[PDB]
Ligand SMILES: *[C@@H](CC(=O)OC)C(=O)N(c1cncc(Cl)c1)c1cccc(-c2cccc(Cl)c2)c1
């Protein structure tokens with residue numbers, strides 16, 4: 001038992017991380033087969049990052065302008081191209097540590113692990129959710145650009161996030177690995193800002209089921225509610241609507257605990273209207289929304305990856 | 307910016323994890339050079355784990371009674387011995403993935419990363435603190451015995467924990483890698499229980515400094531307090547005493563934020579006596595005590611490992 005914010009084992013991704021330097025800008029790249037992927041703003045200087053024309057900036061570059069270091073070994077760049085907001089650097093060596101992988105784009109509300117990196121060297125691993133407003137609440141300092149987010153399914157790494165920038169509220173924005181930003185953000189320095197977020201209702205319900213599996217039951221009750229009646233309450237507290245698909249997805253957790261989904265909604269309703277009255281759930285005094293139903297099943301059942 | 311419960315990158319440990327089977331019991335082992343380390347209760351059956359005589363149980367075993375699998379490759383056991391509560395299985399192959407490592411024993415209040423494993427296959431990574439009562443609040447299911455805890459310093463893995471058992475309150479107990487239990491626990495089935503815990507005061511102060519570094523300041527005030535006066539309050543709220551060494555250790559964080567340590571103690575005093583009045587700190591509505599001053603400096607400054 002127990003319930004932790006648990007990341008995927010990071011080894012398969014550690015073996016892909018490299019350092020990319022262009023001019024005085026150094027950041028991280030992702031080395032898969034004979035290509036290194038990195039944020040295209042590596043080619044920008046201080047004054048460039050104001051209002052850049054990336055096509056113009058890149059035609060002025062040569063292969064030799066990109067220094068790629070994999071550990072203490074230099075990788076010769078033999079080609080380069082832009083794909084949306086990422087650079088693809090062709091190198092003359094295929095990464096022998098390339099895992100089986102996919103490039104997937106995730107949905108707001110889904111979770112992933114982040115391998116934070118500096119100078120091509122991994123620093124730490126943590127779990128993130130993509131917020132409804134397409135930001136992530138990460139932990140990133142200068143030099144972390146190019147760090148990636150991912151999930152692992154058996155032996156295959158599904159890369160879903162490349163870090164690009166920090167927004168003024170201290171949250172983070174980036175792209176999928178095709179270089180397409182998550183949300184209405186751009187790789188230039190503007191006054192862009194996050195804008196309004198909501199709480200991921202299906203995940204809160206998942207986490208309440210995790211709590212019951214782990215012996216926290218004080219918030220349960222005999223009442224039930226209808227889906228429409230619950231969604232009236234969710235709207236009032238800035239929770240996003242619950243759908244019948246969400247109810248279906250919560251089916252297994254409902255069957256394991258014996259608590260009907262709509263019954264757990266009544267409990268969430270009460271928790272929203274009354275607070276927690278000085279008690280905790282799974283060691284938290286807030287309603288936690290960064291665990292998906294899959295995350296709860298994985299952790300409270302125990303799936304591994306090889 | 308941002309602040310997350312961040313684990314060390316797990317790759318160096320993933321390459322050491324193996325499956326150890328004796329009879330019908332399967333758990334995890336740690337393969338370093340030509341030795342596999344695992345909990346000695348792998349040699350016990352259901353009825354054995356009641357009141358076992360491990361010396362008696364082990365003399366009845368042969369090398370061939372221990373099946374060790376590293377992935378899909380079987381390791382031939384050529385010797386075996388007991389060391390306190392761990393088994394050391396000599397195998398005929400040195401692990402080519404052995405990192406530089408040390409066996410260290412940590413103090414209550416210190417943190418480490420856990421690589422949870424099942425059947426020798428890594429499942430997830432998370433950060434843990436050793437509680438004052440020598441338990442850890444982990445996330446472990448059946449089959450997780452033998453999973454290890456560790457820290458990484460540059461390139462060297464300091465192993466500090468091997469998982470053995472879950473206590474009745476759902477918290478976890480284990481040994482250092484010399485096989486000596488943390489706390490007053492034994493590898494037999496008794497009515498043993500955790501017993502009383504306290505909150506790690508120096509870590510809460512560290513985390514308040516992390517909050518200030520990250521822009522949360524609402525809990526600051528103009529008041530100060532003396533060390534003795536603060537410690538009177540800490541005792542009342544089940545916090546452990548703060549020492550002058552703790553104050554010294556908080557020196558760098560104090561100098562970076564410009565907030566005297568004793569001033570932050572006054573803030574903690576107010577937070578204990580008034581609660582948080584519906585506000586949060588670093589996304590928590592509770593005072594967090596599982597970040598050390600080192601953890602805060604590492605994350606809010608950005609040290610990597612290679
Ligand atoms: C990358 C900066 C770089 O290329 O060299 C250090 C970087 O990690 N940046 C960052 C990311 N996350 C958090 C923090 Cl505090 C910094 C970063 C630094 C400076 C500018 C930018 C940036 C600005 C506008 C648009 C974009 Cl896409 C990036 C990012």
Ligand SMILES: *[C@@H](CC(=O)OC)C(=O)N(c1cncc(Cl)c1)c1cccc(-c2cccc(Cl)c2)c1
Nearest residue numbers: 001333446447448449450451470471472493494
């Ligand atoms: C290990 C059990 C094993 O050898 O085969 C599965 C195991 O991981 N156990 C465990 C650990 N953490 C959480 C949970 Cl829910 C289970 C475990 C299972 C059964 C018994 C014991 C045990 C009992 C008394 C003493 C000791 Cl040292 C271990 C652990």
